[PDB]
Design a protein around this ligand. Structure first.
Ligand code: HEM
Ligand SMILES: */C(=C/C(=O)O)C(=O)Nc1cc2cccnc2c2ncccc12
Ligand SMILES: O=C(O)/C=C\C(=O)Nc1cc2cccnc2c2ncccc12
Length: 153
């Protein structure tokens, strides 16, 4: 459980993401793929890491980054009351895409990295810790739903 104050720190920095969801999404996915290139294998080959400029020019990558951050922002605004939003995400990510929790840890790391790089004034230790707790709760709850669907990843 997060405190109300911790939720507020989470949603305060999230409002900065909402000013430009696509740009944040691009930086987060580029960080993910550079730091953990194996995560490209969950998409069509082109399993090969392209240059940063090719990733920034990609209409498909920019769309993916907005798909992710739209869904995650709706989850964070529920302040832990997110069973109904996690249900369809667990369904697809466990049964169709097959995304292991360790890849959700990787993308959580990439989100925290970009938020710290772009908004340090809104992302000191207390806010970083609140965002860490919020993303740990997301991963814990999605993992329990994965198991309910028979996926142990
Ligand atoms: C914060 C974490 C994430 C969120 C909120 C998220 C959200 C979404 C949403 C909303 C969709 C579209 C609807 C659907 O298929 O469920 C989607 C599709 C997808 N996601 Fe995720 N995702 C996350 C993490 C990841 C990660 C880490 C990977 C891979 C390493 C991944 C792989 C996919 C794939 C392969 C698709 C299908 C894309 C396509 O067919 O074009 N997701 N995701
Ligand atoms: C590969 C690269 C290119 O520029 O031709 C390619 O099109 N394959 C591919 C990679 C990829 C990576 C991350 C997310 N989504 C994708 C793709 N999505 C749809 C079709 C192909 C994709
Ligand atoms: O565009 C597509 O049709 C498929 C994906 C893909 O990654 N192609 C590439 C394949 C490679 C193989 C070996 C080394 N480098 C690369 C490479 N380097 C940069 C950008 C793209 C690629």
């Amino acid at each position: 459980v997060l405190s109300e104050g911790e939720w507020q720190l989470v949603l305060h920095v999230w409002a900065k993401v909402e000013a430009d969801v696509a740009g944040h999404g691009q930086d987060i996915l580029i960080r993910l793929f550079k730091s953990h290139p194996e995560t490209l294998e969950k998409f069509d080959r082109c399993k090969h890491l392209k240059t940063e400029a090719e990733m920034k020019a990609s209409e498909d990558l920019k769309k993916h980054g907005v798909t992710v951050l739209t869904a995650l922002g709706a989850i964070l605004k529920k302040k832990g009351h997110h069973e109904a939003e996690l249900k369809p995400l667990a369904q697809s990510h466990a049964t169709k895409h097959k995304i292991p929790i360790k890849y959700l840890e990787f993308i959580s790391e990439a989100i925290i990295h970009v938020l710290h790089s772009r908004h340090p004034g809104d992302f000191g230790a207390d806010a970083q810790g609140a965002m860490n707790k919020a993303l740990e709760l997301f991963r814990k709850d999605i993992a329990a739903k994965y198991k309910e669907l028979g996926y142990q990843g």
